[PDB]
Each structure stands twice: as structure tokens, then as C-alpha cells.
């Protein structure tokens, strides 16, 4: 129960949290008298006003800072100052907020099919990915340009290559390629038109 400068028995930890999830900075501080605790983020003092919804507690030498819904703006370098009459102790980490992403995933893949001549062929895929993938069609390896009766259309995550009337020359290997900043996915199918 004698005077002792503040010290960090448990310092802060640099954390990578996904946006939308909760984040928590905690630290165990010892020093008599019980030090005063202040939180900081990039030079600005942290309170309920600076960062809304934040929760700060100090119980039994355990200081904790909790952000319920972390956003991209909540990132930066966080510091923790402990102060009494005998000295000052400061621990610092930083919060890294990565936006939620997802590699391209073919919910519905291309299906190889054999049809008669003059029939209507519909090649269809449902692609998911964050950020929204760049979906490109390919015929025998070459990129397909949206022709008139060889049309490529999109509705949300659904992509369709509609052939009005299929002919034997339309036979080949059709493939769709979806790429974004986190991955690449491909689907491939063979089409055969008989006459």
C-alpha cells in the first residue's frame, strides 16, 4: 500500500478485426495509488462523444475499451495512459479494420448440354463475391462480345448467354470467368448442336 509508479502487467495487443464485428482493447495496470486511465486514438481523446457506442471500464486494475460495431473509420493507433503522482505509463497498439470480402463463388455452374439445331440455348451462372466480381464470358478461349442473337445479360448475381437459334457452328467450349480483388473462379461447359 506504498507509492508505486504505474506499470503494465498486461499491455495492449494490436488487433485485426473485421468491420461489423466487435473489437476489444484491454490491459492490466498496477500501481499505487490506483492510476487514472485515459484512452486515445490518433491524437484525439476517446470518450462517448468522440466515438459513439464505445464502452470504457476500469475495474480491479483491468482497463477495457470495447467498440460494438467497428467501421473503417474506427481504425488507427490506440494509446492508453496511466497516471498517478509517482509517474506515467503508456501502452499503445493499433486497430486494423479490413472490409468484409469474399472470393468469387459459382452458386450455379455452367452445364454441358447437347441440343438440336434451331433450338434455344441458355447458358446460365450465378456468381457471388465481395467486391462484386468482373464476370466475362469466353468461347473456345476468346472473349465473347454481346451480339444480337448471341446476347449476354445480367440480373444481379445471375448471368445469361442466350442463343436465339442454335446451329452446329455454335458448338464449342463456353467458359465464364469471375475475378475480383480476392480471388478468381471459372466455370466451363461444352455445347454441341446437332443437325
Curated annotation (Swiss-Prot):
Domain Ig-like stretches: 6-96, 104-192
Transmembrane regions listed in the UniProt entry: none
Domain of life: Eukaryota
Changes after translation: Autophosphorylated.
The protein's assembly and partners: Interacts with MYOM1, MYOM2, tropomyosin and myosin. Interacts with actin, primarily via the PEVK domains and with MYPN. Interacts with FHL2, NEB, CRYAB, LMNA/lamin-A and LMNB/lamin-B. Interacts with TCAP/telethonin and/or ANK1 isoform Mu17/ank1.5, via the first two N-terminal immunoglobulin domains. Interacts with TRIM63 and TRIM55, through several domains including immunoglobulin domains 141 and 142. Interacts with ANKRD1, ANKRD2 and ANKRD23, via the region between immunoglobulin domains 77 and 78 and interacts with CAPN3, via immunoglobulin domain 79.
Disease: Myopathy, myofibrillar, 9, with early respiratory failure: An autosomal dominant myopathy characterized by adulthood onset of weakness in proximal, distal, axial and respiratory muscles. Pelvic girdle weakness, foot drop and neck weakness are the main symptoms at onset, but ultimately the weakness usually involves the proximal compartment of both upper and lower limbs. Additional features include variable degrees of Achilles tendon contractures, spinal rigidity and muscle hypertrophy. Respiratory involvement often leads to requirement for non-invasive ventilation support. Cardiomyopathy, familial hypertrophic, 9: A hereditary heart disorder characterized by ventricular hypertrophy, which is usually asymmetric and often involves the interventricular septum. The symptoms include dyspnea, syncope, collapse, palpitations, and chest pain. They can be readily provoked by exercise. The disorder has inter- and intrafamilial variability ranging from benign to malignant forms with high risk of cardiac failure and sudden cardiac death.
Additional remarks: In some isoforms, after the PEVK repeat region there is a long PEVK duplicated region. On account of this region, it has been very difficult to sequence the whole protein. The length of this region (ranging from 183 to 2174 residues), may be a key elastic element of titin.
Protein name: Titin
Residues of the full protein shown: 1 to 195 of 34350
